[PDB]
Design a protein around this ligand. Structure first.
Ligand SMILES: [Mg+2]
Ligand SMILES: [Mg+2]
Ligand SMILES: [Mg+2]
Ligand SMILES: [Mg+2]
Ligand SMILES: [Mg+2]
Ligand SMILES: [Mg+2]
Ligand SMILES: [Mg+2]
Ligand SMILES: [Mg+2]
Ligand SMILES: [Mg+2]
Ligand SMILES: [Mg+2]
Ligand SMILES: [Mg+2]
Ligand SMILES: [Mg+2]
Ligand SMILES: [Mg+2]
Ligand SMILES: [Mg+2]
Ligand SMILES: [Mg+2]
Ligand SMILES: [Mg+2]
Ligand SMILES: [Mg+2]
Ligand SMILES: [Mg+2]
Ligand SMILES: [Mg+2]
Ligand SMILES: [Mg+2]
Ligand SMILES: [Mg+2]
Ligand SMILES: [Mg+2]
Ligand SMILES: [Mg+2]
Ligand SMILES: [Mg+2]
Ligand SMILES: [Mg+2]
Ligand SMILES: [Mg+2]
Ligand SMILES: [Mg+2]
Ligand SMILES: [Mg+2]
Ligand SMILES: [Mg+2]
Ligand SMILES: [Mg+2]
Ligand SMILES: [Mg+2]
Ligand SMILES: [Mg+2]
Ligand SMILES: [Mg+2]
Ligand SMILES: [Mg+2]
Ligand SMILES: [Mg+2]
Ligand SMILES: [Mg+2]
Ligand SMILES: [Mg+2]
Ligand SMILES: [Mg+2]
Ligand SMILES: [Mg+2]
Ligand SMILES: [Mg+2]
Ligand SMILES: [Mg+2]
Ligand SMILES: [Mg+2]
Ligand SMILES: [Mg+2]
Ligand SMILES: [Mg+2]
Ligand SMILES: [Mg+2]
Ligand SMILES: [Mg+2]
Ligand SMILES: [Mg+2]
Ligand SMILES: [Mg+2]
Ligand SMILES: [Mg+2]
Ligand SMILES: [Mg+2]
Ligand SMILES: [Mg+2]
Ligand SMILES: [Mg+2]
Ligand SMILES: [Mg+2]
Ligand SMILES: [Mg+2]
Ligand SMILES: [Mg+2]
Ligand SMILES: [Mg+2]
Ligand SMILES: [Mg+2]
Ligand SMILES: [Mg+2]
Ligand SMILES: [Mg+2]
Ligand SMILES: [Mg+2]
Ligand SMILES: [Mg+2]
Ligand SMILES: [Mg+2]
Ligand SMILES: [Mg+2]
Ligand SMILES: [Mg+2]
Ligand SMILES: [Mg+2]
Ligand SMILES: [Mg+2]
Ligand SMILES: [Mg+2]
Ligand SMILES: [Mg+2]
Ligand SMILES: [Mg+2]
Ligand SMILES: [Mg+2]
Ligand SMILES: [Mg+2]
Ligand SMILES: [Mg+2]
Ligand SMILES: [Mg+2]
Ligand SMILES: [Mg+2]
Ligand SMILES: [Mg+2]
Ligand SMILES: [Mg+2]
Ligand SMILES: [Mg+2]
Ligand SMILES: [Mg+2]
Ligand SMILES: [Mg+2]
Ligand SMILES: [Mg+2]
Ligand SMILES: [Mg+2]
Ligand SMILES: [Mg+2]
Ligand SMILES: [Mg+2]
Ligand SMILES: [Mg+2]
Ligand SMILES: [Mg+2]
Ligand SMILES: [Mg+2]
Ligand SMILES: [Mg+2]
Ligand SMILES: [Mg+2]
Ligand SMILES: [Mg+2]
Ligand SMILES: [Mg+2]
Ligand SMILES: [Mg+2]
Ligand SMILES: [Mg+2]
Ligand SMILES: [Mg+2]
Length: 248
RNA sequence: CGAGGGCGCACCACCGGCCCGUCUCGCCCGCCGCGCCGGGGAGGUGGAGCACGAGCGCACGUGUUAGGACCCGAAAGAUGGUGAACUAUGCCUGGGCAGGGCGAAGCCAGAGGAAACUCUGGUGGAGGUCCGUAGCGGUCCUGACGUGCAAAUCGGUCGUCCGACCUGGGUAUAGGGGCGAAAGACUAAUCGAACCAUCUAGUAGCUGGUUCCCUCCGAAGUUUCCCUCAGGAUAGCUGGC
RNA sequence: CUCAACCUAUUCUCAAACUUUAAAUGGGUAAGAAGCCCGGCUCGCUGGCGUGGAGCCGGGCGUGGAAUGCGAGUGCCUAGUGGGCCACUUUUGGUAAGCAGAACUGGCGCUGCGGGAUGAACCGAACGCCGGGUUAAGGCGCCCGAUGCCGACGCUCAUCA
RNA sequence: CGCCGCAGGUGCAGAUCUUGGUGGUAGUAGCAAAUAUUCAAACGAGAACUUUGAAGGCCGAAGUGGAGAAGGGUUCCAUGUGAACAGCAGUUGAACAUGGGUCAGUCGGUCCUGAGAGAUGGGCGAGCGCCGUUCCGAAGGGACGGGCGAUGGCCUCCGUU
RNA sequence: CGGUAACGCGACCGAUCCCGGAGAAGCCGGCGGGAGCCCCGGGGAGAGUUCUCUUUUCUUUGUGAAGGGCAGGGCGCCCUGGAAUGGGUUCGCCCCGAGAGAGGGGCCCGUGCCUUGGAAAGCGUCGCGGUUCCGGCGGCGUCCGGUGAGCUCUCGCUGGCCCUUGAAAAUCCGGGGGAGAGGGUGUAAAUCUCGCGCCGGGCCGUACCCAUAUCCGCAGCAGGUCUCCAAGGUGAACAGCCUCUGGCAUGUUGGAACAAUGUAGGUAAGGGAAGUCGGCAAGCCGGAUCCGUAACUUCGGGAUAAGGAUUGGCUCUAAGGG
RNA sequence: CAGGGGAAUCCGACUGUUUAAUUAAAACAAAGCAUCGCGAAGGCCCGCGGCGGGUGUUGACGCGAUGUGAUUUCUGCCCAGUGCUCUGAAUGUCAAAGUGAAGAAAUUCAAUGAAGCGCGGGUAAACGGCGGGAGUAACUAUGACUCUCUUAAGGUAGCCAAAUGCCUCGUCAUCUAAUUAGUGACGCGCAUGAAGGAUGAACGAGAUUCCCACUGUCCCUACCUACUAUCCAGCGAAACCACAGCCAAGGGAACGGGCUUGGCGGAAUCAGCGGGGAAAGAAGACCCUGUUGAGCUUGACUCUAGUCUGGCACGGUGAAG
RNA sequence: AGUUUGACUGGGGCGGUACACCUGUCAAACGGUAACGCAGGUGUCCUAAGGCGAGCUCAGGGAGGACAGAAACCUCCCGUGGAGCAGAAGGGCAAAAGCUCGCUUGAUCUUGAUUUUCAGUACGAAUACAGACCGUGAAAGCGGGGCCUCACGAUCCUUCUGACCUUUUGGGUUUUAAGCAGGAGGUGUCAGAAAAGUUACCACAGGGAUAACUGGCUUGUGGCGGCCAAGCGUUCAUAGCGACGUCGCUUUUUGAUCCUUCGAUGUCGGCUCUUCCUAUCAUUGUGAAGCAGAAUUCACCAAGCGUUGGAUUGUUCACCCACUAAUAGGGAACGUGAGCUGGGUUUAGACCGUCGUGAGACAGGUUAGUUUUACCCUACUGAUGAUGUGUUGUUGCCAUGGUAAUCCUGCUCAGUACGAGAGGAACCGCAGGUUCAGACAUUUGGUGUAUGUGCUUGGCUGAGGAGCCAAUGGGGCGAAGCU
């Protein structure tokens, strides 16, 4: 009869992201005439640590083509780029690590970092550290490009979508065991209130579907339908299968 | 006074009769409408009826009922508000944590060895490291106290004491909601649904109470029915006129 | 020769759910005037028949047709109650129960009083306030009213009467 | 107030009844956590407790020391009083009464933003309103620069407009 | 305007605009500098002891801000030059043909010292007058040194840790650029972040308590309630114990007794858990030095395993430095 | 000022956290392991409402939802059941709307056929389940071996009278003089067992057994100290109270202070004490009843937010079928 | 989200249905009559098993007949029903009510009355008529279901049937709808709601109308006795026993019941402490033996005195070790929680096994879990006092109440009596111990703040000397007193 945890997360109050010390939204520069037709040269000024994010951010400085002014972007750092390096964004940009150019102008098999989901928005795909997408095929008739997302799923996008070349820095961060409840505490204190996690079987029936019983047992199948109401769908949601993955 | 006789009030029993409904049987009558028209009879039976009215208004008493309903009494339910000064958790900005032990990586030197490499002594000062202050906690005495110092405190003994550490202030989350390293915990001494006012004199087959005198009469705990078995209706028993 | 079963005549012992017979106590009805006896009339019922039956109309009969006691009949409104319990006797379950369950009458509940020392129910008796007399049940060594009778006849000795 | 009528918020021993008052308990339990007081004198009606002096002790700098924040709100400081209060007392008091006391360019607030809160535009909403905080706004009311001039005047030339 | 340079000098024209800096950054370690305090040796002034001894013991023995100068600390700043037989160097590190060692410079901080302030004040003593209660008047003094793993602040250097990287904005400044402005050689002009001079700074708060009696807990309630300063001895020590400065009167009463039963604290012959549900409670052990340490193990631990010896006072000796 | 120590068993890895006011634990958390959803027109969630809002200043090395719980080593069989999920294969059923027919219309009938349910696959680190019957070896006894049934499979590796074993204080060994205790072992195990089983250092105010040392826990009590209690001056409550207050027996609502019969009974008090007053504290919380509730659950009844699906409208322009 | 989750009931739950009915009995000779009284039955079945009429006689047995037998069919005789009538039981029934045939649909349409339960309400069932229309029989008649006693169902709603019926709202026609009358669809909790759990996180109103603990009745069961004497006892009923039976007592067992207590009587065990009982384990005095002695057994008077230390377990019980004269059994609100303790049971946390879909449950295991108040009355323990002898004191008496001692060992008797032997006593006496009691401190021990006297750590008074503080600084020895 009580609103469960997970239901309370959508209200926001105590579960909002900790964004006090975040350095800004990491994103490409807006597509403009210079990037749509030629290229524009920027210079990497610093590579910084964004709290709550494993990928380093790159602070790149461009020239505004219409006003005497300097523009500072907050690219996602592709691995290998350094300060004092020139990166080039545009259609005519060359195929080098850190450059930003449309997918339609890249050979099949190119590894990319900050890929646009829609032509014009800034980078949306393969942004987490060590991840990358791959260009698979081109359809110049429909102005389409087929790519392979980090999850393995294939996706057809417009050829005007831009991406950074290379993998995103931050390497194999998940390889190191955390080893300590304290290090998990510091990891999630920079992200949001999602830790520690109390098992539902350890709760009372009032605050969880799995709660209650004289033994800590689920009592009902933990696989739950997709259209189950909020407050009921806990456990394995819409699970196509369960159990140890044998076969692939 | 009076055997006998007569008219007989009210009322009671019975038998007839009349009105409406409904059956059964049957033959007649009426005429501006000749009809799938209208009326009538006899014999049963259904009616809270007729059969020379008794009602209306007012007052009083008793009984039953709806209302706060003889008085006091729930656990609850609903509507609208007030609280995070305590606590729970997130964030912001500050403050704080003796003295010792162990001795991680890194580094220096020496030695052994044919090499490969190993050994030894220093240095270094890591760690949700150990002993142990302050702080934070609260194990046991099942100690004190138990109309207390105290609506949870005190003594000794204890756990931890560089971290998932302690803490001020500022903020955010509000009641079927919040928040929970999860005990149904905490949410102003209140929590298995806070507090405040109202609906509300909530309902109670249940408990308690129910205020002057004398006189007269005087019970029942049984029948039948009831989601009836601590209650009613019903007959009985009672009193009054 | 012997033992079974069978039959016949006997013999022992029984029955809430067996019975020929069959009480006591018990239940119903009658013990007149709305009765009896005479005549007649009505009927579509019945029918050999003036036959039956019923109803109706007149008339005559009072020794008022057992005992005993009592004044009856009738209507309206109506409260409380709807937990009962006990005793003699009958009686079911139970080893039994101050158990549980029935029948009959009485009681307590609702009830005081005399007696049972004491006691809701036993025994006597029911109640206005009193005087006198007499009792019931029960008593009469002393408590404590009354045997302080020259009471009658026996029985009994208990170191748990 | 009696009598004849009329009308009631009309009669109390109870309700762990309501309000008020009062007993026994009972001059009882008690005034026992953190070592501790003593001598002399003064004032005074009155001294275990006030004041002064002399001793003996305690806190032992993580104080029983010296200062602040929050909170209190005059408790601060003098003088006086001895009703009540300070669970004994008091000549004392944070009590009572009468007066007095808080002085800033440079100590803070004020200013800035933080987590956040919150109008407008817009949207929603029966509605009080609430959602949202850059989102769906014609969102800059400013400026030495230049020009047209009013020459407003110490109209030279520089301020104004 | 000067210097090869780092950069310096008292100013050092300049808008819109652009770039940058400061504000503006965690925790922990180890070193170093400065101060305050503590300590030691003398010189004064005043006190204490003097039964005996003690040239003794105690107290006290200043220099604000803001300037100027000078030490001291730091520099990932410059010039010369070119280094292996590598050298320099730290407690640790670390550094160098991308320029070591050496020599010479420059800059930053300068809270330390001197000086203006400044002795005239303050303080300590010793006196003399009074304004019933004079910032009175006066004398004398306010001195010289030494030490440190010392404590506390502060400044600096250099490391470590992080799947943790530790605000923002007001506000202030520097630079880039050169739109412009200023005078015709003067009596100079525009301009000036240089020196001195003139005027002003409104509003609100401000006492006191800050807790075993000024706050919350119904109270003068053994509870709760955020901080700053921090002496001597012992000692590893902000431990416990004793003391100085400062504070207090024993925690809302006293007096007399010393029964039981309590509450708190001790001791107990011989035995040693036989007590009890149960070694509950109490007791044993304990610091430091020198030895000596097992099984097992995730090789880190176990581990202060277990077990043993020693420990005072006094008189010396030896080693460890500038 | 200032650790008693040692040998083991159970549980939890450790550090951390927890029921403020009876439970600090073995409970929670944890790192590690595993599973699930999701490529943004999205997953999960809030919201009365807005193309509103949180995750999200995010993007699969991420976010969301679960389970187990460090290391080591393993994690067996079962997809019948209930879940979940995948494709609709001629398809069964299936509402509104739409279509056709009859009728004078209301209406009636028929055809058509969305999700869903059925049907068919997958899935147990989803919920869960893992049994009997027979026959069968040359002492007996068991059954290596062979058939079955319910039916989806019959409990594998391990571990055990375990915090899980009724019988049970199981049986054997060991520890003791003596042991329902402990440890080791056995195992047809009422009713052990594999994301949890079995181990294994370090750790623990966790549960247990033993040994050394140590002692007033005890034999068996004594003495001492401080504060009380005590007495006094001053000050001064509360709880509770039908009336009260000596007993034995009787009867009685079956345990009397009162009543009957007996024993008896002598002011006013002080310090103690805990036998009685079925002492006080609270309209028993156990148990039952009530056509009295509330918290929670679901295969109860009746609904509902949200979601999936069909239809109508916004809703338009062209062609191929 | 809202609500529900029956009742009865020797508490409730589980189980049953005694919840609507029928038969016999209970039931006490009218009728009626109860319990979770006894023995049973019912929710159907039948176009015939209904209705007439006719004709027959059934069960069983005896005797016969080819196969044919103990049972096949045929025949005769006996046959009061001993068969059958659908079913449970009871009644009833013989040219019946049974069996077999023939014809049939009275199992139809109607109005009232009555009986049964009963309130004299309903339903159901039944009885007697009356009016139709039929069946059957020659007819009298019989028949509107079953030989009788059971076999079943309101309002509202639905559905069907009937009246050339009524209404369908200003009139008319026609669909439709409503109505009147009679059937059916059903409520089995059967006079008739539409209904799953859990709560140890729990709540309220109450209940001693009702359980768990004491007490009370009872005493089946437990325990302890007696009577008879078949037998056991080499023989011998009775030294010691006691089968088959039978009579009792007890209330330390467990039941049975539910009278008191639910505005509360604190619920196990242990510890502590007192008293009581006797059904006597030991001790004193005795009697009997299959008592030679020693030992043992049975019984009597008898409760004065004693009845112990430990391992395991919460235990009560149990069991073992060891001592002993013996290690008897019990009561006192299963004595004793303002006496304690809190191990157990019995709240809330948690784990495991089993059960359940789940919440959750488990006379299953395990771990952690607040034990409050006396100052009142009495009782008791002690302490002053009080009444009466004129006051006051000394010395006394004893009414009454209490009461206290207990058991064992060794030596001697005595290697004696007795006995074949092995063994093996007793009385008198002596020396001592156990348990208990009342004292006491010469001695030994304990205490020790005489704060007595040394020693000693840290600090403090300038040092010496003398001291002090550290909640008794520590420690050695220690008078007196207490013990
Ligand atoms: Mg978890
Ligand atoms: Mg839980
Ligand atoms: Mg739920
Ligand atoms: Mg569960
Ligand atoms: Mg008539
Ligand atoms: Mg009436
Ligand atoms: Mg009322
Ligand atoms: Mg409701
Ligand atoms: Mg707060
Ligand atoms: Mg640590
Ligand atoms: Mg520690
Ligand atoms: Mg306690
Ligand atoms: Mg719970
Ligand atoms: Mg009310
Ligand atoms: Mg009642
Ligand atoms: Mg009876
Ligand atoms: Mg009565
Ligand atoms: Mg009467
Ligand atoms: Mg009477
Ligand atoms: Mg009498
Ligand atoms: Mg009598
Ligand atoms: Mg008499
Ligand atoms: Mg007399
Ligand atoms: Mg009144
Ligand atoms: Mg009154
Ligand atoms: Mg007193
Ligand atoms: Mg006192
Ligand atoms: Mg001191
Ligand atoms: Mg202070
Ligand atoms: Mg003052
Ligand atoms: Mg006073
Ligand atoms: Mg005042
Ligand atoms: Mg100076
Ligand atoms: Mg150099
Ligand atoms: Mg001077
Ligand atoms: Mg001030
Ligand atoms: Mg206080
Ligand atoms: Mg207040
Ligand atoms: Mg005080
Ligand atoms: Mg004191
Ligand atoms: Mg005092
Ligand atoms: Mg001893
Ligand atoms: Mg000893
Ligand atoms: Mg023991
Ligand atoms: Mg013992
Ligand atoms: Mg202990
Ligand atoms: Mg060890
Ligand atoms: Mg020496
Ligand atoms: Mg743990
Ligand atoms: Mg583990
Ligand atoms: Mg805690
Ligand atoms: Mg607690
Ligand atoms: Mg606790
Ligand atoms: Mg693991
Ligand atoms: Mg996890
Ligand atoms: Mg379909
Ligand atoms: Mg599978
Ligand atoms: Mg196995
Ligand atoms: Mg086992
Ligand atoms: Mg066990
Ligand atoms: Mg033991
Ligand atoms: Mg074992
Ligand atoms: Mg598995
Ligand atoms: Mg008595
Ligand atoms: Mg009650
Ligand atoms: Mg209650
Ligand atoms: Mg009822
Ligand atoms: Mg409810
Ligand atoms: Mg359903
Ligand atoms: Mg009879
Ligand atoms: Mg009869
Ligand atoms: Mg016939
Ligand atoms: Mg018949
Ligand atoms: Mg009924
Ligand atoms: Mg014989
Ligand atoms: Mg009763
Ligand atoms: Mg009864
Ligand atoms: Mg009580
Ligand atoms: Mg009591
Ligand atoms: Mg005897
Ligand atoms: Mg008892
Ligand atoms: Mg108690
Ligand atoms: Mg008691
Ligand atoms: Mg316990
Ligand atoms: Mg529990
Ligand atoms: Mg299960
Ligand atoms: Mg505990
Ligand atoms: Mg005597
Ligand atoms: Mg005696
Ligand atoms: Mg000394
Ligand atoms: Mg000396
Ligand atoms: Mg001192
Ligand atoms: Mg001594």
């Amino acid at each position: 009869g009580r609103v469960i945890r997970g239901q309370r997360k959508g209200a926001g109050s105590v579960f909002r992201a900790h964004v006090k010390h975040r350095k800004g939204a990491a994103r490409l520069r807006a597509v403009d005439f210079a990037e749509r037709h030629g290229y524009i040269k920027g210079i990497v000024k610093d590579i910084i640590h964004d709290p709550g994010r494993g990928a380093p951010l790159a602070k790149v400085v461009f020239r505004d083509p219409y006003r005497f002014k300097k523009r500072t972007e907050l690219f996602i750092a592709a691995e290998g780029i350094h300060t004092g390096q020139f990166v080039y964004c545009g259609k005519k940009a060359q195929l080098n690590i850190g450059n930003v150019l449309p997918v339609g102008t890249m050979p099949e098999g190119t590894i990319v970092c900050c890929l646009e989901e829609k032509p014009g928005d800034r980078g949306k795909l393969a942004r987490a550290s060590g991840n990358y997408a791959t260009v698979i095929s081109h359809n110049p008739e429909t102005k389409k490009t087929r790519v392979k997302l980090p999850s393995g799923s294939k996706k057809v996008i417009s050829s005007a979508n831009r991406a950074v070349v290379g993998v995103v820095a931050g390497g194999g961060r998940i390889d190191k065991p955390i080893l300590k409840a304290g290090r998990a505490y510091h990891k999630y204190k920079a992200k949001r209130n999602c830790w520690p996690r109390v098992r539902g079987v350890a709760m009372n029936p009032v605050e969880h579907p799995f709660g209650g019983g004289n033994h800590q047992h689920i009592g009902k199948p933990s696989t739950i339908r997709r259209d189950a109401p909020a407050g009921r769908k806990v456990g394995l949601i819409a699970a196509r299968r369960t159990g140890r993955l044998r076969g692939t």
